[PDB]
Design a protein around this ligand. Structure first.
Ligand SMILES: *[C@@H]1O[C@H](CO)[C@@H](O)[C@H](O)[C@H]1NC(C)=O
Ligand SMILES: *[C@@H]1O[C@H](CO)[C@@H](O)[C@H](O)[C@H]1NC(C)=O
Ligand SMILES: [Cl-]
Lengths: 127, 110, 117, 125
């Protein structure tokens, strides 16, 4: 009763969040002086929540690539595709927008909860 | 109960619009499905409890890109055009919520 | 091109009025409505069309165009949007895509607790 | 693409019905209107038929096909009378009067108004 093997999901999520986070570190080296601690934590949450929100369309794209492989997939295929998602998305549209508009979300306990979990454990919905 | 959302339109085709939505609801109410009707296809979204965000492109590698329909002419105004998508939220109870997400783009040239 | 406007009603039982003037020396126009693609002929000068807010029903007027919608809109939770689009194909010229939009106030009903509680 | 007699039956009945509706409306709200404004509304009836001829033809073809037999002119008289009765032109009369938007009466409108209903040109799509 699984939509996707758990190992494939974990590979994807780890690589996606890692890529988003690398982008956020790069952005914070420039703009991080202006932000409070809780705002920075809120942007880390924004990375994980963005993966949550868009997981289903990510799965459309992933399923296309996997199908184009023409063979049974292995975990390495999902590691690679998750890294591709993590690199290609430019989260700075959101970081810049939220900073400039003073719209960084107020940091709440559910955000802290998501931030404390390992990326591998961030829950996602396939449908 | 519903979602509290807004769209933040750029005045420039190079900056995608920002869709930002928050769901404050009892945990027993969920958005079972959400779909955004874009000119390049129907893009599925999971509207989690709390904060959610999405980009909408004016023009068209990466998964999930949503491009506005348009441009559309608007009456009596020759200096702007309309870009739009619609979305449907299907809830765990009650009628669905249909959103109109619209952005006006200054017209080149006027 | 065409000089047009839509005149929206204050009541869903009163249709909107689309009024257009062709001042010129339009091959066809089609309106994408919730009850189908409605063809319109743009004669020289004055042209009119009704656009209905409420659902398609058997004994409506023949040829009626029903709005798509209602849609929720941002920054006002007390109003809904109704819309159709139209495409004009000109002689040898590029097509024109029109957005025909009307806002209607919601009924201001008091909210009620979510059933699942 | 329609035999001329059938077209004529349609146009005669549609314009006649629109005009009767306008008569009923004018008995109530017509006192305030100038003669030329009333003429402009008669034109509005004929032009409305012109603008909507193609979608009316979708409807008419649907009915005629539903007859399940070869149609005769009387079928088009009946269906055209139905269109002439059913269209709520009063929404337009009310709007145009209330908003002071009755179109200025121009020569092309007079030209169309002077035509026999049977001769009003229509375009088949
Ligand atoms: C056209 O719309 C813009 C806003 O999108 C507005 O500033 C401008 O005044 C409008 N022009 C006319 C003629 O109404
Ligand atoms: C919706 O909000 C706008 C501005 O906030 C207001 O002008 C308009 O009247 C509102 N619509 C209704 C139906 O109240
Ligand atoms: Cl709709």
């Amino acid at each position: 009763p699984k939509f996707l093997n758990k190992a494939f999901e974990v590979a994807l999520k780890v690589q996606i969040i890692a890529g988003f986070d690398r982008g956020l570190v790069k952005w914070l080296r420039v703009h991080g002086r202006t932000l409070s601690t809780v705002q920075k934590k809120a942007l880390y949450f924004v990375n994980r929540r963005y993966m949550q929100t868009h997981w289903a369309n990510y799965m459309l794209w992933i399923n296309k690539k996997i199908d184009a492989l023409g063979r049974t997939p292995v975990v390495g295929d999902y590691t690679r595709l998750g890294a591709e998602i993590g690199r290609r998305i430019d989260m700075a549209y959101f970081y810049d927008f939220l900073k400039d508009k003073n719209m960084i979300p107020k940091y709440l306990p559910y955000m802290e909860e998501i931030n404390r979990m390992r990326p591998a454990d961030v829950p996602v919905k396939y449908m | 109960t519903g979602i509290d959302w807004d769209v933040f339109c750029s005045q420039n085709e190079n900056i995608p619009a920002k869709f930002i939505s928050r769901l404050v609801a009892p945990k027993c109410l969920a958005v079972e499905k959400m779909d955004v009707d874009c000119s390049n296809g129907l893009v599925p979204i999971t509207h989690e409890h709390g904060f959610n965000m999405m980009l909408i492109q004016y023009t068209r590698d990466s998964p999930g890109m949503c491009v506005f329909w348009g441009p559309y002419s608007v009456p009596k105004n020759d200096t702007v055009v309309l870009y739009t998508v619609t979305a449907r939220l299907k809830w765990s109870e009650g009628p669905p919520t249909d959103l109109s997400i619209q952005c006006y783009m200054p017209k080149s040239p006027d």
